[PDB]
């Protein structure tokens, strides 16, 4: 007891130091940043908030544990008050209550008592200015607390957060409206909480009404104030409207627009993966392979760990339907390895045309595919592999006989081979002529693609791609 008793006091000062100065330096700093300039936004503290919340989402959040009473949530949410420069006294009173945890017997004011606490910035009379700071006070205590996931009676407090922070949404739409620049700072905060909206419902029931409530904030951001706001709302749509039926696939046509400009960076990179799985159910491979490839190369920085790895797993799924794929272990990660083992040997059976090997993969490894929901392709991927097998042979040989390729690709009969080659010509896969007597297939080398034709015509898209980046560099140069 004396050994562990003396080690209890030291830690809580650590949240009283860094976690204090988290919203003391940033929040007190963003005060003057959100009072003016306010260009854009920027307000880089809102992006610095991405380097805090996501950092806090591991440690320490607000709590924790660490060996405190979880009294940081009531501390900053009380006594806002605020006014002219005496707001420093509020930060000074935040230092005064630090000794309360270390001296007296500490008491936990979270949970049940957090209901009037979120009303206090309104009850302090008055805020009087920044809702994003109170939105932060209605989120950063509660939303990182959602990671506990105890599911008992505190989920309605997570809903009470989504209630009183919807009262912040009431102050979001009603207040300002003219050169706000807090909404663009809130578009990062409103995004997150709307993400936590979707997350909290997934543990109880998927949201039917919030789907209607999503289009509310969706449509109302147009055209008055929209920067990055509708994109994050469109991400909420395509995320869940994918996993749940129906008709949401073709919905992307009337929504886009794009919506420009893509923000922020990797945030829009995953969006191409979302519509990527969509366009995969449209059966169009070519537009799906370019949006999936662009989804990996445009996505920084990780780690950790498998969040980027699992999304990359199902990303190369469109490559299984392309018909041209290499062995995917070049994309393997030691952490993703154990999870991709049932999905690994799959593509290894795609490179071969054996039915007994391909069907054995579906039987044993089909259990892993149930969680992915990828069973739509397994019926049409049989027709994809037979195109890869015939392309391997047709590219390796000038002439290929139907009887020799019959059992080599084990089509087993001459009649269905005439049906496959016919549809292969219909799809433009093979140029082979066929001489029908028994019959047999006699092809010839295809040429004249040459030099003067394809490379210089493709270079029209290459330079038009490059000369636009010259403007992209100038536009990016004009901001500094």
């Amino acid at each position: 007891p004396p050994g562990g008793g003396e080690q209890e006091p030291p830690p809580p000062p650590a949240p009283q130091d860094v976690e204090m100065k988290e919203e003391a330096a940033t929040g007190g700093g963003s005060t003057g940043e959100a009072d003016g300039k306010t260009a854009a936004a920027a307000a880089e503290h809102s992006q610095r908030e991405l380097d805090t919340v996501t950092l806090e989402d591991i440690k320490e959040h607000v709590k924790q544990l660490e060996k405190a009473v979880s009294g940081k949530e009531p501390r900053f949410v009380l006594r806002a008050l605020r006014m002219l420069p005496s707001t420093s006294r509020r930060l000074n009173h935040y230092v005064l209550y630090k000794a309360v945890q270390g001296f007296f017997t500490s008491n936990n004011a979270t949970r049940d008592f957090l209901l009037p606490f979120l009303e206090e910035p309104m009850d302090t009379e008055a805020d009087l200015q920044f809702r994003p700071r109170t939105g932060k006070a209605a989120s950063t205590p509660l939303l990182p607390e959602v990671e506990a996931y105890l599911q008992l009676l505190v989920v309605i407090f997570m809903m009470n957060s989504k209630r009183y922070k919807e009262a912040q949404k009431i102050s979001d739409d009603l207040m300002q409206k003219i050169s706000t620049q807090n909404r663009r700072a809130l578009d990062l905060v409103a995004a997150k909480c709307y993400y936590y909206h979707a997350r909290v419902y997934e543990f109880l029931d998927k949201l039917d009404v919030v789907r209607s409530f999503l289009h509310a904030r969706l449509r109302t951001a147009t055209l008055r104030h929209d920067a990055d706001g509708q994109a994050t709302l469109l991400n909420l749509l395509l995320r869940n409207y994918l996993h749940y039926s129906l008709y949401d696939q073709a919905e992307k046509l009337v929504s886009k627009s794009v919506f420009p400009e893509q923000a922020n960076n990797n945030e829009w990179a995953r969006y191409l993966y979302y519509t990527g799985r969509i366009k995969a159910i449209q059966l169009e491979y070519s537009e799906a392979r370019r949006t999936m490839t662009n989804a990996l190369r445009k996505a920084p920085q990780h780690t950790a760990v498998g969040f980027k790895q699992t999304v990359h797993k199902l990303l190369i799924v469109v490559e299984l339907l392309l018909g041209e794929i290499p062995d995917r272990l070049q994309f393997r990660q030691p952490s993703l390895k154990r999870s991709l083992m049932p999905y690994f040997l799959l593509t290894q059976a795609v490179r071969t045309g054996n039915l007994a090997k391909f069907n054995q993969v579906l039987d044993q490894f089909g259990e892993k595919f149930q969680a992915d929901g990828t069973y739509t392709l397994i019926i049409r991927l049989r027709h994809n592999v037979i195109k890869t097998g015939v392309r391997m042979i047709s590219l390796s040989y000038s002439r290929i006989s139907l009887a020799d390729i019959a059992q080599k690709l084990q089509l087993d009969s001459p009649e269905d081979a005439e049906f496959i080659v016919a549809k292969a010509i219909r799809d433009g896969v093979i140029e082979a002529s066929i001489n029908h007597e028994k019959g047999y297939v006699q092809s010839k080398e295809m040429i004249d693609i040459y030099s003067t034709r394809e490379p210089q015509l493709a270079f029209h898209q290459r330079i038009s791609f490059c000369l636009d980046i010259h403007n992209m560099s100038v536009k990016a140069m004009r901001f500094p």
């Binding site: 789907r211 209607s212 289009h215 509310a216 449509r219 109302t220 008055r224 008709y247 919905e251 009337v254 929504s255 627009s257």
Partner: protein
């Protein structure tokens, strides 16, 4: 797939169809995008007296797919039911299109200078002084002189 219900020419099915729409239209805004051609059948029907309201649902679909000025055209022929709603956001977005169209027409009218007048709808000029009555009733004098500078 309730779009097929519009094939019937009997009216009493249409009011129950729009009764479904306008309530869930928030969630179904994407669904109304394909109802364009079959809404015009009701809007162009002479025996259909709800065309005033059918012009509103025709303005919502075009606003969903990116069309704006066309929704302002239907706002004209939408009758008194369109200008009677001052609630929430939809009132300030339409007057931004309508008054700007009104004030750019008045500047054009002063360039005639006289004679050869362009057609001026009584509904677009009618809400000018009508909504201007909300000014003198609100007693605020600062913007009372502002409308006179707007319309010139």
């Amino acid at each position: 797939g309730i779009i097929s219900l519009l094939d019937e020419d009997e009216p009493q099915l249409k009011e129950f169809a729009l009764h479904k729409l306008n309530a869930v239209v928030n969630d179904f805004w994407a669904e109304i995008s394909e109802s364009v051609d079959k809404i015009e059948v009701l809007y162009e029907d002479e025996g259909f007296r709800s065309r005033q309201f059918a012009a509103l649902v025709a303005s919502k679909v075009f606003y969903h797919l990116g069309a704006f000025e066309e929704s302002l055209n239907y706002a004209l022929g939408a009758g008194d039911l369109f200008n009677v709603n001052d609630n929430s956001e939809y009132v300030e977005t339409i007057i931004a299109k309508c008054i700007d169209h009104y004030t750019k027409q008045c500047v054009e009218n002063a360039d005639l200078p006289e004679g050869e007048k362009k057609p001026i709808d009584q509904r677009l000029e009618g809400i000018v002084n009508k909504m201007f009555q909300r000014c003198l009733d609100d007693h605020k004098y600062k913007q009372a002189i502002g409308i006179a500078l707007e319309t010139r």
